[PDB]
Every structure is written in structure tokens, then in C-alpha cells.
Design a binder for this molecule. Structure first.
Ligand SMILES: NC(=O)C1=CN([C@@H]2O[C@H](COP(=O)(O)OP(=O)(O)OC[C@H]3O[C@@H](n4cnc5c(N)ncnc54)[C@H](OP(=O)(O)O)[C@@H]3O)[C@@H](O)[C@H]2O)C=CC1
Ligand SMILES: CCCCCCCCCCC[C@H](O)CC(=O)SCCNC(=O)CCNC(=O)[C@H](O)C(C)(C)COP(=O)(O)O
Ligand SMILES: [Zn+2]
Lengths: 87, 209, 96, 129, 115, 342, 145
């Protein structure tokens, strides 16, 4: 089983490479959380880190979609792509 | 005397040593980098490693130096420097009743022209330097371990070599032969950090960086 | 004095005594467990409490240079006695 | 500025194979580069001016005999001193040792005024002297 | 900075050259050394132990370093040839008396806090 | 485990192994090796001895200070056995004698003494008792050595249920009285193999393999109650085995055939010696008897060990017996003898 | 019961309430047969079949970086943000207050001492709570050196 357990977003605070995800999170993150209140979206940020997405699936599986330099629309389109499959 | 405890200081020897220090510095400016006379009237000459042979030859053969006895040849391992090893020569002049110090520098992987040609006394001193520290010397006749046991690993006097060593010895009855095992001290060497956190000598106060 | 342990072994003044289940006891068999009998903890108690009519005293353990370094004890608290740290001899002000 | 058959030796210095250290004590040891803090009991600072190199501690059991603190790790009492972090951090991997480095803690300058002890308004006025 | 004068070899090619005949000088006398020192071990395990010692020093990629082991091995050959090392010194290479230290993480966790 | 018995260290001399051995009869062939293997790991071995303290001197430099403790014990005394095993984790039995002393016969030293050791150990409260008996232990074999051993192991099993019993086939080593015994027979003219030794089949086992087998049994948790059988990897016919001994020793070979009853007589003749006898009648029977294969009993390999062939460790024993003409010969000069299928 | 390692017996990674993630160092090895906490779990996973990837302290620290990159940035406060987004989410749902006054668990000194397992097992700490509870007369020793 690969049902969605948690989504981890690692973004840099000021790096232009992680600028796009910052544009996403101020606007669209709240609406995403209202859609999946049970889903633990993790936004553990850092400094000088390549903006990446970790998606923990059931039975201990983790995908490593990397949203480097992705714009806010790109970040959102990656998100619904990951959670499009309920399993 | 007003200084019954302070060791008396000689200025005439200081002037003579200082004058000779300038003399050697002008003679071979190709290797002599810096020269200093310590407070207790001892002269040190800082040469470049390539000048190991020419400088020693001049001190051995010049009519005004005649330093014809290598007292000892040792090195001080200072890891904080780029060239950790610091080879030191000590020569004595019988004719002029004086001693000189000639010191070079060397990293781990660099060979030094063996002074066996100039001072045949250096021959055995060279083996000790290589054995204790690992400094290889080119053109040495019989460069090999002198003090450490046969098949010894590492160089003991290096500051990064533990005092107790890596291997101890024991007679193993199963093989009926003395064998080597990893070290296991019955009581570990209790290191003592006994450096007072208060400045000792303001004269040698290194300026801040 | 010396107190014997329940396992049957003399207890040192430090309170050391091997447990019944302790394997490190076979050494003592066919030998004797060295222990001193003059327990300094006890012997110091028998020393009488000296009484001096002065606020402070100087104790050197007797013998001058053969004793401990000279210390000065403040015999002001009438509740208890002042004991030299080095040797343990007590002192007391007689009703001040 | 020295023509002594000079060749390009770009690759990093790897003297580890010559120091004679066994294989175990060359990877599984994590050295620490740090400026020792002043002994808080004292107030002098002459022991916090040189970078120190030390190896992580290991097992220290008790002898079946009187019971000293035995050990089996030779790299237990080895402490090295370096005058600059760069020299210290360079000596680690040159000898081939995994390291972690802690930056020097400089006591920040604090403005102290004696007149503040007796302040007309500020609560810094002391009640005893 | 990137350039420093060499020991014996100017690059890896001649440094590797000085390794080969050192291995040659180490291959030939192993049966002679075994005969000389009354080795319990046969000739065969002598030859690959020379091979294995030469093998473990393979990651070296520096001409100055390779010269240092090359000359150090030469002394080791010299010490062995003129009976300077006895049986105990020779048997030191064969780590016999010490028990094999297991390599799996589970065994290390069972025996002690060794990382 | 006790608070002072938790293992510590890295297996060296100063490391605390955590086993308090009580190796009985350690002043002997296997006793020397088992103490050494216990000595390396740092185990407080309580070695009892009845011989001269001088004969135990070689035992002293095998353990850290305070580890090897020497105690005086007597076979026919419960108090002595109790004194030595009162504080112990494991008790190792190694008492044995290839001949019958005036004060000690095979009955005394292979049944009576093991009975007292096993019975007292259980009363003391030890954990494991490792008892050793011959592989050829049998109740009906004429050799009283094998007959006594079979009775003793059954009795020890009754007194101490979870007592590991070791059944080595035949040890060979520096002082084995097995390879040395055959090599020493050059003095007596030729070698008088019984029936030319064409029927006896032996499976000698290296002494070091047995020693590590005992140590592995101590640390193993499944050794409780098992009955092991220690045998070498190969299996040799007697005539070819003696061929390998004399070829490795480079000594002349004279295969004298000698009748069994006559051999029993010369064994009687050599028995008369008050000192250490060269050979007894029981010894003659033993070398004449074969080593039966017992696959049901767990083998040496089950104790995480690999057996060592005799042809690999042969020069160790027979280098001494070689004269100056062959004192420097290599190991592979003599190839292994015939290997009957195991 | 599985004996673990104390904070003075392991090279751990603790994060303070301000976000700084600092690390401790092995002052002395754990007593007896007690082992390090992470090695216990990793060894347990290997026995159970589902062996974990990391096998060394660097490996698990690297894994710690993957889960949260700010757990490796030692002695560095990684400033968070997006307070407004957290505020907007808290506007969702409605939980009402209660009349119980805000009483901290520790009001005086006596209950500051006896908090955690190490403190509870301590002997010198028991004298302190004994001292503050009753008067001075219950705490005194012939203290000279
Ligand atoms: N091939 C073999 O020989 C095999 C032997 N075994 C068993 O191994 C054990 C030891 O063999 P090994 O070491 O070669 O024998 P050794 O004769 O070399 O040594 C025997 C040991 O037992 C002691 N001992 C014997 N009889 C007495 C006695 N009556 N009272 C006190 N101590 C006594 C001896 O003391 P001291 O030295 O003072 O005489 C010595 O310590 C024996 O039980 C033997 O049967 C098992 C399998 C194979
Ligand atoms: C007789 C009893 C004692 C018996 C026991 C005796 C044991 C000790 C014997 C002496 C050993 C000797 O010190 C070893 C030394 O000096 S150096 C080893 C080889 N190391 C290098 O040369 C470095 C560079 N490495 C390479 O060049 C490549 O690894 C390779 C060699 C494979 C060639 O590669 P190519 O092919 O690309
Ligand atoms: Zn006093």
C-alpha cells in the first residue's frame, strides 16, 4: 500500500531557487490544508538548501520530487500531481 | 650582587654572535632567511631546505667559521605548520670556541639532502630522524630504521602518534612464539591538563589576530 | 573496630566488602584479606575536646614542622565544636 | 620559484598510508576541532587561544584487580594544538580523519559603567555595595 | 602550491614501475624466506600475503607517496633478507593470535559500543 | 549476569570476558591450550593443581595480573573440589591419565573424579560444566580407558544434566603422545604395526581446534546438555598415517607385523616402569582400535569452527624429531597419505 | 526492558525551545550492557527483518537531515516564517475557553527539583526538596573540605 502519509517541503529562506515555493506557500498553502486537514504537510525550512519535496507513502516509502527553481504555479501543479492518486 | 638569583647576562658574547650572524647572512643570502641571537647568547640560522648542504659546508670549511663538529641533528614536530617537521643542526667550532644552530623546515613528503657528505657524524643521526619522525633523506647510504623494532609501523615521535602506541607484545603459548596484539592498558594514562589560564610571561604575548 | 560481613569477611574502614554473589572473592581463599584494624574514623573520636578561653585557636597537629600546616579555627558557634580539617582534633570555648 | 623537477601534485595530501595507523582508528574515529572554553571556576582566558584536536571517547571499564580505568583505545589521550582553524582542519583529512568543527566563541563586548550603580531613575541602581 | 618536487618518481608511471620490481623482489625470496626462517606456513600463503599487502595500498594516487611505500617496502625486504627479522616479526604479518573481529553491525552491537 | 560479570573490553588481556573458568587438570596438554584461550579473552580462570607449583609455572604468563589463580586440590577430597569451584561460572573437566598409577587407576580418574566434580559443581551452583571423554568411549571395549570413560560420561550426565560432554577423537599437537608416540618408536628397532595396521582407521583432530571448540561451547547458549564429538576433517588408515608421520619426520620405515597377543605382552613389559611408562597394554589396544563415525552427535563444525587437517599442521610436531639432515626441509615436500572416505 | 544510553553517554542531537539544534558528546560510555538508543532500534529492525538504511551516526544524522534539514545546522537558529498562514488556519475550527485559572505545574521551588527520571533518581536532589519543604534544621553536615 502506498497511500499518502505525509508531504515534506524543504525550502530555503532567501535563496532565489526557492523563491517560487515561497510564492506558493503564502497563497495556496492554506487552501490545501483546508482540503486535507488530516494530511501532515511539513514545511521544515532551512538556509542554502535546494527546494525539494518528500512524499512519505505507506509501508515506509518516500519519493524525492525536487522543485528546484519551480514557480508558484509549477509548485502547485507538482502538488496536485503527487496527491492525485489517493493510494 | 643585586641579582643573586637572576642568571648574569653577557653582552660581549651577544655582540660577537650578532656580528657573526650578519656575517653569515651576507655571505649566503640565497638560503639564510632570518637569523636571531637568543637572550642567553645562542645563535640560530634559519636556512631554506635547499641550502642544507651549501650552508653546512661553508660553516665547516670557512677559515672564519671552522664549525667542525656536528653536536646533534634533531627535528621538532609542529603539526600547526604547513611543514610540520623542523630539522635542527647544532655545530660546535673548536677553533673559535662557539656553537651555532642551523634549522630548516620540511613537510611529510619531501626529501632532504643528507649531510653525510659534510659531517659523517650525521649518518646515524639521519636514521633516527627518519625512524622517529619519517623525514626521508636522499643520497643517504644506509637509510633504515635504527631505534624502533623490526617491522614497526608509524613514526613514534610524531605528535599525532599515541604515547602508548598501537600494538603491545605477548608470548602466546598456542603458537609458542612471541606475538603482537592491539594495545590494552591495565590502567589508562591519566592525562593532566595543568596549564594555568593566566598569562605567564608578558614578553612573549603573541599579538592578537 | 572491624565488623564482619554476613558472608564472613572483614569490612574495611572505607566500607568495602565483597558481596556474596561477587566472583572476585576467590583471590582471598587460601590467603588473607588485608585490612587495617586501627580505624582512624574511630580512634579520632576518643580524643578529648580541648577547652580554651579564646575566640580563635591555632592547631598545627603538634611537632611544629612535623605536623600539618597551621590553621586557625573559629570557636564562636557555641552549638558545636571546631575541628581542625587536617587532623580532626576538636576545640571548644568553655561557656565562652 | 624553485626549479627542482617540479611536477603537478594537485591531488590532496594523503599521508594516511604512511602514519602506520591501523584501519580501525582511521575511519570510525570522529575528531573534533574546537577552542576550549575557559574553566568556569577560574576567570583567566589564557587557555582559550589555541585550537584543540581530540578524538571521541571510547569504552573505559574497570579492572578485575583493584580496578583502575582500563582502556583499549590508543587515541584516547591524544590532544593536539593548532594556532588557526584552517591549519587544524587541514591536519585532519591530511591524516584522513572525519572531523566536525565548532567555531570559536568570542565573549561579546559588554558596556560597563560604574555610575550606573547609582542611577536616579533606572532600576539598575544597586541596594548594596 | 599545486607543484612540489618529487622523491624518485616524476609521475604515476615510473612510480608504478618501481612498485613492479619491488613486487618482483618480494615474490622470488618468499620460498627462500620460508626456508630460511623455518616458517610453519607453506610457501603459497606467503606469496599472496605479499600480494595482499601490495593490494591494500592501491588507492594511493600520488607519486611522492608511492615512492615512500616503495622505499619502505625495500627496507622491509632488506630486513627480511639478512635475517634481521625473526620468526615472530615475520608471523606478525599473519594476524594469528587475535580473534576475528566481526564486520556485521549486529555483532558489533552485541559486543560493545564500538562504532 | 552478576554486576561484576558483565563483559567489557575488546577481547584482549585486560578485557573482562565475563566467564570464571575452573579448568581441572589444566597442568596438561589440553589444559595448557584451554587456559591460554581463556587467558587471551580475559577470563579469571581458577586453575587447581596437585603437582609441583614449578610444573605450573608455564601457566602463569597467559593471563593478566590477578586472572589466573592457582589452588591446591586433591582428587579424593570433596572439600578441595568445593573450594576451587565455589565461585565459578563454568567448570572444565580435563582430568585423565593414559596409564594406571598406583594410587589412581582408570576407574578412579575417569569415573570417580568426574563424579565428584559434577556432583559438587551442581551443589555449588555453577552454570555450565564441560566434561571431556574419548570419542571411542564404549562399555564393552577391552581397553579400560575407553570402558572407564563410557561409565564416567553416563554418570556425569546423571549428576549434572545440562553438562556439555565433549568426545574428541584423538588430539595431535606439540606434546600429544599421539604423533610423538609413533615418532618415538624409531628407537625400538622398527615400527611394529599390529597386523601391519591395515585395518585400523583413525580420525585425528587438531588440538587447537579442540581448544577453540571448548571455548565456543562455553559462550554458546545451546551447548547446555548437548554431547559433542570432535573429529578431524580427514580420516586416515593407520598404516598410511604412520607413513605420513615418518615421511614428514624423514625417518626410516620398518613395518614390522606383530601378533596382537605378543603386543599385549610387550605392553605389559613396558608397564612395569615406576616412572612415566612408554606404553601400556591399554595404549596398545587404543591405537589398534578404530574411531567409529557417530554422525548423530553434533560435530565440531556446529561450534562455529573449521577443522584443521593434519597434513596442514604436521611439521609442528615432527620438526623436532627430524635430524640435522632434515631439520630445514619445507612443509610441502611430503604429500598427504591415503585418505579413506570419511 | 531495553537498557538505553543517558544524555552524557551518547552523541545525540537536542533542539532547544528556540529552534537551535545542538549536539552532545560522549562523556562516558553507558554502564553495563546498555547501548546507544539509535543503535538499539536499528539493531532491532535488522532482527525483525525490516532493516533500516542508516548504519552509522553520520548515516542517521544524514537521514535526520532528509526529514528536517534544520536538525543538522548545529548552533544556527533557522528562522521560521508564515505566521499569518498559521493564524489563518487557527481561525478555522472553534474551541472555547474554560473557567479554570492558568495554574503552572510548578509554583514554588519545592516542585522544581523533582521533574525527570534522572532528577527523580538523584540523591543530592532529594536533599534539596527535603530542605525547602521543612526548615533549615533538616539539612546540615560536618562540612570541612
Ligand atoms: N587423545 C587424547 O589424549 C584425548 C584425551 N582426552 C581427555 O583429555 C583429558 C586430558 O588429556 P591430556 O591433557 O592429554 O592428559 P595429560 O596426562 O597430559 O594431563 C592430564 C591432566 O590431569 C591431571 N590428572 C590426571 N590424573 C589425576 C589425578 N589422579 N589427580 C589429579 N590430577 C590428575 C594431570 O595432573 P598432572 O599433570 O600433575 O599429572 C594433568 O593436569 C583426559 O581426560 C583425556 O582422557 C579426550 C579426548 C582425546
Ligand atoms: C615473506 C614474509 C612476509 C610476507 C608479507 C610482506 C608484506 C609487506 C611487503 C611489502 C609491501 C610494500 O610495502 C607495498 C608498497 O610499498 S606499494 C603497494 C602497491 N601500491 C601502489 O603501487 C600505489 C599505487 N597503486 C597502483 O599503482 C595500483 O594499485 C596497482 C599496484 C594495482 C597497479 O595498477 P595498474 O595496473 O593500473
Ligand atoms: Zn590539626
Amino acid at each position: 500500500k502506498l497511500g499518502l502519509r505525509e508531504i515534506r517541503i524543504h525550502l530555503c529562506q532567501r535563496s532565489p531557487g526557492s523563491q517560487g515555493v515561497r510564492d506558493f506557500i503564502e497563497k495556496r498553502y492554506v487552501e490545501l490544508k483546508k482540503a486535507n486537514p488530516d494530511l501532515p504537510i511539513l514545511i521544515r525550512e532551512c538556509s542554502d538548501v535546494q527546494p525539494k519535496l518528500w512524499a512519505r507513502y505507506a509501508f515506509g516509502q518516500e519519493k524525492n520530487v525536487s522543485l528546484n527553481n519551480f514557480s508558484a504555479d509549477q509548485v502547485t501543479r507538482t502538488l496536485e500531481n503527487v496527491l492525485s492518486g489517493k493510494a | 650582587d643585586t641579582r643573586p638569583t637572576i642568571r648574569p647576562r653577557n653582552d660581549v658574547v651577544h655582540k660577537q654572535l650578532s656580528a657573526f650572524g650578519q656575517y653569515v647572512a651576507e655571505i649566503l643570502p640565497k638560503y639564510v632567511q632570518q637569523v636571531q641571537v637568543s637572550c642567553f647568547n645562542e645563535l640560530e640560522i634559519f636556512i631554506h631546505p635547499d641550502g642544507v648542504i651549501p650552508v653546512l659546508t661553508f660553516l665547516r670549511d670557512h677559515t672564519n667559521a671552522q664549525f667542525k663538529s656536528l653536536a646533534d641533528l634533531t627535528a621538532v614536530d609542529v603539526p600547526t605548520r604547513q611543514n610540520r617537521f623542523e630539522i635542527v643542526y647544532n655545530l660546535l667550532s673548536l677553533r673559535f670556541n662557539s656553537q651555532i644552530r642551523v634549522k630548516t623546515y620540511t613537510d611529510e613528503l619531501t626529501p632532504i639532502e643528507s649531510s653525510v657528505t659534510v659531517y659523517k657524524a650525521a649518518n646515524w643521526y639521519e636514521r633516527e630522524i627518519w625512524d622517529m619522525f619519517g623525514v626521508f633523506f636522499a643520497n643517504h647510504p644506509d637509510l633504515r630504521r635504527i631505534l624502533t623494532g623490526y617491522g614497526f609501523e608509524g613514526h613514534p615521535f610524531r605528535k599525532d602518534f599515541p604515547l602508548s602506541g598501537y600494538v603491545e607484545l605477548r608470548y602466546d603459548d598456542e603458537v609458542k612464539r612471541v606475538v603482537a596484539e592491539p594495545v590494552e592498558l591495565a590502567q589508562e594514562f591519566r592525562k593532566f591538563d595543568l596549564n594555568s589560564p593566566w598569562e605567564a610571561f608578558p614578553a612573549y604575548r603573541q599579538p592578537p589576530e | 573496630g572491624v565488623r564482619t560481613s554476613p558472608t564472613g569477611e572483614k569490612v574495611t574502614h572505607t566500607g568495602q566488602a565483597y558481596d556474596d554473589g561477587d566472583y572476585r572473592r576467590v583471590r582471598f581463599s587460601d590467603r588473607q584479606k588485608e585490612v587495617n584494624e586501627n580505624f582512624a574514623i574511630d580512634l579520632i573520636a576518643e580524643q578529648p575536646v580541648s577547652e580554651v578561653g579564646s575566640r580563635v585557636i591555632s592547631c598545627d597537629g603538634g611537632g611544629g614542622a612535623l605536623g600539618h600546616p597551621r590553621v586557625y579555627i573559629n570557636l564562636d558557634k557555641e552549638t558545636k565544636t571546631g575541628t581542625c580539617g587536617y587532623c580532626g582534633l576538636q576545640f571548644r570555648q568553655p561557656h565562652h | 620559484t624553485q626549479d627542482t623537477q617540479l611536477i603537478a601534485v594537485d591531488e590532496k595530501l594523503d599521508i594516511t598510508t604512511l602514519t602506520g595507523v591501523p584501519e580501525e582508528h582511521i575511519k570510525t574515529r570522529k575528531v573534533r576541532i574546537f577552542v576550549p572554553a575557559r574553566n568556569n571556576m577560574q576567570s583567566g582566558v589564557n587557555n582559550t587561544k589555541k585550537w584543540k584536536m581530540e578524538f571521541d571517547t571510547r569504552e573505559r571499564w574497570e579492572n578485575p584487580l583493584m580496578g583502575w580505568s582500563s582502556t583499549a583505545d590508543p587515541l584516547s589521550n591524544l590532544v593536539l594544538t593548532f594556532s588557526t582553524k584552517e591549519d587544524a582542519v587541514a591536519f585532519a583529512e591530511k591524516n584522513g580523519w572525519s572531523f566536525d568543527v565548532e567555531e570559536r566563541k568570542v565573549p561579546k563586548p559588554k558596556s560597563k559603567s560604574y555610575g550606573a550603580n547609582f542611577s536616579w531613575n533606572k532600576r539598575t541602581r544597586v541596594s548594596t555595595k | 602550491g599545486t607543484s612540489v618536487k618529487p622523491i624518485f618518481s616524476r609521475d604515476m608511471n615510473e612510480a608504478k614501475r618501481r612498485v613492479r620490481e619491488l613486487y618482483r623482489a618480494w615474490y622470488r625470496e618468499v620460498p627462500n624466506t620460508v626456508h630460511l626462517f623455518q616458517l610453519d606456513i607453506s610457501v603459497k600463503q606467503g606469496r599472496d600475503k605479499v600480494r595482499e599487502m601490495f593490494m591494500k595500498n592501491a588507492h594511493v594516487t600520488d607519486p611522492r607517496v608511492v615512492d615512500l611505500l616503495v622505499i619502505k617496502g625495500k627496507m622491509e625486504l632488506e630486513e627480511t633478507i639478512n635475517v634481521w627479522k625473526q620468526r615472530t616479526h615475520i608471523m606478525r604479518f599473519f594476524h594469528e593470535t587475535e580473534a576475528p573481529r566481526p564486520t556485521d553491525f549486529l555483532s558489533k552491537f552485541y559486543v560493545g559500543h564500538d562504532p | 549476569l552478576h554486576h561484576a560479570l558483565i563483559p567489557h573490553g575488546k577481547g584482549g588481556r585486560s578485557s573482562v570476558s565475563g566467564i570464571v573458568a575452573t579448568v581441572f587438570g589444566a597442568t596438561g596438554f589440553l589444559g595448557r591450550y584451554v587456559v591460554n584461550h581463556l587467558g587471551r579473552m580475559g577470563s579469571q580462570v581458577i586453575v587447581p593443581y596437585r603437582c609441583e607449583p614449578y610444573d605450573t609455572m608455564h601457566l602463569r604468563p597467559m593471563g593478566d595480573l590477578g586472572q589466573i589463580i592457582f589452588m591446591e586440590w586433591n582428587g579424593k577430597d570433596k572439600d578441595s573440589i568445593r573450594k576451587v569451584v565455589e565461585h565459578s561460572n563454568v567448570v572444565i573437566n580435563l582430568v585423565g591419565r593414559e596409564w594406571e598409577t598406583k594410587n589412581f587407576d582408570f576407574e578412579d580418574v575417569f569415573v570417580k573424579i568426574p563424579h565428584a566434580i559434577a556432583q559438587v559443581s551442581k551443589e555449588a551452583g555453577v552454570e555450565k560444566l564441560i566434561h571431556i571423554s574419548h570419542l571411542n568411549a564404549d562399555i564393552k571395549s577391552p581397553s579400560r580407558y575407553l570402558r572407564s570413560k563410557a561409565v564416567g560420561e553416563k554418570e556425569v550426565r546423571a549428576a549434572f544434566p545440562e553438562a556439555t560432554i565433549i568426545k574428541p577423537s584423538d588430539i595431535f599437537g606439540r606434546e600429544d603422545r599421539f604423533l610423538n608416540y609413533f615418532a618415538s618408536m624409531r628407537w625400538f628397532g622398527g615400527v611394529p604395526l599390529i597386523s601391519l595396521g591395515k585395518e585400523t582407521v583413525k580420525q585425528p583432530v587438531y588440538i587447537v581446534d579442540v581448544s577453540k571448540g571448548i571455548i565456543n561451547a562455553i559462550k554458546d547458549p545451546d551447548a547446555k546438555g548437548k554431547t559433542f564429538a570432535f573429529v578431524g576433517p580427514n580420516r586416515y588408515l593407520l598404516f598410511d598415517l604412520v607413513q605420513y608421520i615418518f615421511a614428514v619426520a624423514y625417518r626410516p620405515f620398518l613395518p614390522y607385523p606383530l601378533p596382537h597377543f605378543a603386543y599385549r605382552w610387550v605392553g605389559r613389559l613396558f608397564e612395569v616402569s615406576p616412572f612415566e611408562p612408554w606404553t601400556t597394554r591399554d595404549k596398545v589396544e587404543r591405537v589398534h582400535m578404530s574411531d567409529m563415525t557417530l554422525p548423530h552427535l553434533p560435530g565440531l563444525e556446529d561450534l562455529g569452527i573449521q577443522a584443521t587437517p593434519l597434513e596442514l599442521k604436521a611439521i609442528e610436531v615432527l620438526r623436532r624429531h627430524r635430524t640435522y639432515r632434515w631439520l630445514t626441509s619445507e612443509m610441502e615436500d611430503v604429500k598427504p597419505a591415503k585418505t579413506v572416505n570419511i | 526492558i531495553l537498557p538505553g544510553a543517558a544524555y552524557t553517554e551518547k552523541s545525540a542531537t537536542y533542539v532547544n525551545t528556540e529552534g537551535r539544534a545542538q549536539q552532545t558528546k560522549v562523556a562516558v560510555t553507558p554502564p553495563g550492557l546498555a547501548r546507544e538508543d539509535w543503535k538499539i532500534i536499528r539493531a532491532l529492525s535488522e532482527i525483525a527483518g525490516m532493516t533500516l538504511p542508516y548504519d552509522t551516526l553520520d548515516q542517521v544524522r544524514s537521514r535526520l537531515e532528509e526529514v528536517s534539514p534544520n536538525l543538522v545546522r548545529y548552533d544556527d537558529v533557522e528562522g521560521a516564517n508564515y505566521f499569518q498562514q498559521a493564524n489563518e488556519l487557527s481561525k478555522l475550527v472553534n474551541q472555547q475557553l474554560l473557567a479554570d485559572p492558568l495554574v503552572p505545574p510548578q509554583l514554588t521551588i519545592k516542585d522544581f527539583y523533582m521533574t525527570d527520571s534522572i532528577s527523580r533518581a538523584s540523591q543530592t536532589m532529594a536533599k534539596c526538596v527535603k530542605a525547602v519543604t521543612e526548615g533549615i534544621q533538616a539539612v546540615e553536615e560536618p562540612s570541612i573540605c
